[PDB]
């Protein structure tokens, strides 16, 4: 449950038994011949794995520096890496004998993923969402109802994500005998940070095979965006022992670090305990969660996974920021140059990769983790542009 000093299981006694059941269930089914056979069947047959590793020939020539490969997670079913974890946990829940999935969502991206996975394996899906978020995400809400899920608007307090979390946890505490709670990222109490990483590790395994196939050697740098950490850990983890490979997590710089409107939890946060984990969080003088901002909705989260805090600590991974403006240029630049419309979360990774590539030799190799497609971001990008 620890990653160095970070991680843990800082929850009340009401949530201990459901987590201890999940620890046990993961332990037996994690390396089970039949569990992994089913997981790999669904990932291949339903999700479309493996995803290709694409050489951005035009983009690298433009920059004039290092080679830039995109790990095309935009091409998985749903349009983001989140499907990998959605299936993984939903299948684990079915192997536990659960008949129902619950989760909570802000932007709706995790709600859609959870609903899709529940639809596949034939499970009841109740998704808690803040009443503010339901009006904001008209189209994501509808998308969940198409997939057989039903959204529960929570009308108390802030009417934000945080209020939906509380409703989801109160619901799990009472229904855990037949219900599994699905966490979207490498965050929260143990065993969720390890479970989610393990279900995203496919990205890095595939990418390592693919880069050895294309280059005959490991890459010099790997760049990936970091909100909670999910996609970044998926691609990072298999390269952690490869001393050559530089790991660069890219957080939301927002309107700039001087402005204070961002979600760079690793760059500008303090270590604290929220959401059941000791990790980095963005907090005020009094040690309360601050409001965060990012143009990319998936990066708008004040916390960060405890494993990233650990990598930061021991200096295995380097963590950086990219502004709304910079990510937006990358969004446009990749669409023009490679004919790929990246998700605004991924555009952060692409944006930094492009800066880094200019300063590197033409024989060096960068793998950018293109965490999703940006069809969902067209309403946002149209209004701003």
């Amino acid at each position: 449950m620890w990653f160095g000093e970070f991680g843990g299981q800082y929850v009340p006694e009401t949530l201990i038994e459901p987590l201890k059941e999940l620890e046990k269930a993961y332990k037996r089914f994690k390396d089970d011949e039949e569990f992994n056979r089913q997981l790999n069947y669904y990932l291949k047959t339903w999700a479309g794995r493996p995803t290709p590793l694409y050489y951005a020939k035009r983009l690298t020539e433009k920059i004039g520096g290092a080679k830039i490969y995109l790990k095309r997670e935009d091409l998985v079913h749903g349009g983001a890496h989140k499907t990998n974890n959605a299936i993984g946990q939903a299948l684990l829940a079915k192997f536990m004998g659960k008949t129902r999935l619950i989760a909570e969502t802000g932007a709706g991206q995790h709600g859609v993923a959870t609903a899709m996975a529940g639809a596949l394996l034939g499970m009841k899906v109740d998704i808690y969402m803040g009443a503010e978020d339901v009006e904001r995400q008209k189209m994501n809400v509808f998308r969940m109802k198409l997939l057989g899920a039903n959204v529960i608007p929570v009308n108390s307090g802030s009417r934000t994500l945080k209020d939906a979390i509380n409703e989801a946890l109160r619901d799990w505490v009472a229904t855990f005998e037949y219900t599994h709670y699905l966490i979207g990222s490498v965050v929260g109490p143990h065993p969720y940070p390890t479970i989610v990483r393990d279900f995203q590790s496919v990205i890095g395994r595939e990418a390592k095979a693919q880069i050895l196939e294309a280059e005959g050697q490991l890459p010099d740098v790997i760049v990936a965006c970091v909100g909670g950490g999910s996609n970044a850990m998926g691609i990072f983890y298999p390269f952690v022992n490869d001393k050559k490979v530089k790991l660069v997590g890219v957080e939301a710089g927002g309107k700039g670090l001087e402005s204070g409107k961002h979600s760079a939890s690793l760059n500008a946060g303090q270590v604290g305990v929220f959401h059941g984990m000791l990790s980095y969080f963005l907090q005020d003088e009094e040690g309360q969660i601050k409001p965060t901002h990012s143009i990319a909705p998936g990066l708008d989260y004040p916390g960060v996974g405890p494993e990233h805090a650990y990598l930061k600590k021991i200096q295995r991974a380097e963590y950086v920021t990219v502004t709304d403006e910079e990510a937006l240029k990358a969004f446009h630049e990749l669409s023009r140059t490679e004919g790929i419309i990246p998700a605004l979360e991924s555009a952060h990774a692409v944006a930094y990769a492009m800066k880094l590539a200019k300063e590197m030799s033409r024989d060096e190799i960068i793998i950018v983790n293109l965490s999703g497609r940006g069809d969902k971001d067209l309403d946002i990008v149209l209004k701003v542009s």
Binding site: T14, L15, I16, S156, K162, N166, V273
Partner: protein, 241 residues
């Protein structure tokens, strides 16, 4: 750490302001055997809707940690009723465990419950608590097995605080039944009491104290600065007077 048969009001500090919380405590003190005082937190993952709203209210009006201690200190000028501080771990963690508990003791805090600090992560907390003259409160739920409930009891030096998963649930009386059977410590119940039938019934089944939170904070939520008299009428109803 309180007289048997007692009623224990739970209020969130700084809801709607620190002066109001002190007024409420002073008005309720003649009715109470002990008091729980909640410390506002941004993301309170345990608490039910009515208490959750009070955390939102208190921080929206600019509550600060030093104001909780001010309330306990200014309350101690009039009363020596046991105070139990109910907080999440992050205030304790960021201030330093000893620094927090020392400052809590100086105000006149008698006990403390860290809501989101499990038993297996509290080996150090209980140790320093004893050294700084502060008693520990740990909570148990209905799903808590008999193996842990003993370990919960062993680490508690004040009272074990029983809560429910959700008039009063069948599963909640089973928890209380088991607790009196297993625990050497005293037991306070926080099962969401709203009426006199419940206070009497829980004292009858052996609860040493009956905590009253939601019923009082609902009133504070409705009335604000003017809650004092409505709180008294509610506490009088629950004491049957």
């Amino acid at each position: 750490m309180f007289k048997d048969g007692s009623l224990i009001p739970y209020l969130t500090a700084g809801d709607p302001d620190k002066q109001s919380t002190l007024n409420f405590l002073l008005a309720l003190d003649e009715y109470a055997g002990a008091i729980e005082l909640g410390i506002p937190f941004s993301d309170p993952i345990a608490d039910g809707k009515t208490i959750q709203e009070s955390h939102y209210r208190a921080l929206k009006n600019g509550f600060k940690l030093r104001e909780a201690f001010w309330i306990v200190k200014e309350f101690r000028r009039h009363s020596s009723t046991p105070i139990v501080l109910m907080t999440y771990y992050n205030p304790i963690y960021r201030a330093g465990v000893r620094n927090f508990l020392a400052e809590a003791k100086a105000s006149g805090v008698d006990g403390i419950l860290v809501v989101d600090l499990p038993v297996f992560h509290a080996k150090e907390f209980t140790e320093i608590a004893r050294e700084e003259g502060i008693k520990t409160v740990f909570l148990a739920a209905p799903n808590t097995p008999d193996e842990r409930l003993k370990v919960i009891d062993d680490m508690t030096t004040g009272f074990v605080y029983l809560v429910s998963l959700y008039e009063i649930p069948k599963t909640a009386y089973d928890l209380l039944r088991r607790a009196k059977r297993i625990c050497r410590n005293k037991v306070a119940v926080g099962f969401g009491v709203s009426k006199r039938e419940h206070v009497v019934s829980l004292l009858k089944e052996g609860a040493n104290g009956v905590v009253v939170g939601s019923a009082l904070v609902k009133i504070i939520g409705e009335k604000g600065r003017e809650a004092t008299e409505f709180l008294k009428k509610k506490v009088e109803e629950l004491l049957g007077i």
